[PDB]
Amino acid sequence: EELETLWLTGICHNEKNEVMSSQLDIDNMAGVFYMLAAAMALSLITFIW
């Protein structure tokens, strides 16, 4: 255990929560655009009658 603590580095742990979230999501405004296209369809339904 002492040798495996010595000769094995352990800085990079499992799934760090660091800065790598780079402020951009693609699926969020995509799903908002799906609900927006549903709103377009409902607006067309209210437009035809």
Binding site: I11, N17, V19, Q23, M29, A39, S43
Partner: protein
């Protein structure tokens, strides 16, 4: 540099005031001079006899040129086998000084450091919204600029003296655009805030327990003082030979050389006493040490063998310990210390003022036309 220019100059500071306190306590006269080289003193080979000798303060003390050494004496086991020590006035360990001082989020990532999806996205979104509002309004089952101003006002959420048009079916479009706008600005505010909370990477060393320094490279240039007692302390230990071989390639004469080298990024780390690096961190604001403390040692008085200035001198040191003269030495040197919208929102206001000048130009062209 200069072999034959020896000048009487003025000495002061911490240990000088300590020596003045010792001369105030005990009745004696003295003679203060400086050491010839810039080294502490190491058991180092001489060119003949297969025998190691001493240099530095020990080399001038054991030769009889000196009598008593008042200095940051790195207390170890090798020097105690030859000379006698004193009880330490200072208690101090070892640490690493690095450069963990780099500004983050130089513009707070508003539109220019972040990529260009959001601005053009809102632009063509409100364009398509305005086009379908015009298709609803010109064929109902001013008008142009009023619908545009209503779209920008619902997108912008401040409250302005506008009015919604006849929206018997376009109120659904307006409420979806309102929910659209607020969910976008809420997600944007939330992830910018939570991004500038978690904007703390790891560029440090974290003391002696760094396997990146157990197997070093050219990326982490850590060194030491040429012929230092810390080098002897690392030469003794059985597994610290790799850091010894790393530091022996870049041995520096004085500590200020390493200070200016890590200031100009010539180095990456430096093994040194802790409170001195804390004092220089109070001096230079671009220096922060690490956290792991090791080799908690003492600074006292370099002494000879059996001498009448051992007993009452140690009594005077402990007399300085018991009263508030240690607090006086703190108040002189030890305790004595020394979204900003200036880097971030400067370019924000530059683009805002450019939009101001362009809007003023377009308004005067509109007045010249109308």
């Amino acid at each position: 540099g200069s072999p034959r220019h020896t000048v009487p100059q003025c000495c002061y500071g911490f240990c000088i005031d300590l020596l003045i306190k010792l001369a105030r306590t005990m009745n004696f006269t003295y003679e203060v001079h400086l050491v010839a080289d810039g080294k502490f003193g190491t058991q180092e080979r001489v060119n003949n006899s297969n025998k190691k000798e001493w240099n530095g303060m020990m080399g001038e003390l054991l030769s009889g040129q000196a009598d008593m050494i008042v200095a940051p004496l790195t207390i170890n086991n090798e020097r105690a086998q030859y000379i006698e020590f004193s009880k330490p006035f200072k208690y101090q360990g070892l640490t690493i000084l690095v450069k963990k001082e780099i500004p983050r989020s130089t513009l707070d990532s508003f539109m220019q450091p972040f990529q260009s999806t959001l601005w053009l996205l809102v632009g063509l979104s409100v364009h398509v919204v305005a086009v379908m509002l015009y298709l609803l309004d010109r064929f109902s089952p001013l008008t142009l600029s009023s619908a545009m101003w209503f779209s920008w006002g619902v997108l912008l959420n401040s409250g302005i003296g506008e009015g919604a048009p006849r929206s018997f079916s376009a109120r659904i479009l307006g409420m979806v655009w309102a929910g659209f706008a607020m969910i976008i600005v809420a997600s944007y505010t939330a992830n910018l805030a939570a991004f500038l909370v978690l904007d703390r990477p790891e560029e440090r060393i974290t003391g002696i327990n760094d396997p990146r320094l157990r197997n070093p490279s050219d990326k982490f240039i850590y060194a030491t003082v040429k012929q230092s007692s810390v080098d002897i302390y690392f030469r003794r230990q059985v597994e610290l030979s790799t850091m010894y071989r790393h530091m022996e390639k870049h041995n520096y004469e004085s500590a200020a050389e390493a200070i200016q080298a890590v200031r100009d990024n010539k180095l990456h780390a430096f093994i040194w006493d802790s409170a001195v690096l804390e004092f220089e961190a109070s001096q230079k604001c671009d220096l922060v040490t690490t956290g792991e403390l090791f080799f908690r040692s003492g600074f006292g008085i370099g002494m000879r063998k059996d001498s009448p200035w051992k007993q009452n001198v140690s009594l005077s040191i402990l007399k300085s310990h018991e009263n508030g003269f240690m607090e006086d030495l703190d108040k002189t040197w030890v305790r004595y210390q020394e979204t900003l919208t200036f880097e971030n929102m400067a370019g924000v206001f530059m683009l805002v003022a450019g939009g101001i000048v362009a809007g003023i130009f377009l308004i005067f062209i509109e007045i010249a036309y109308k």
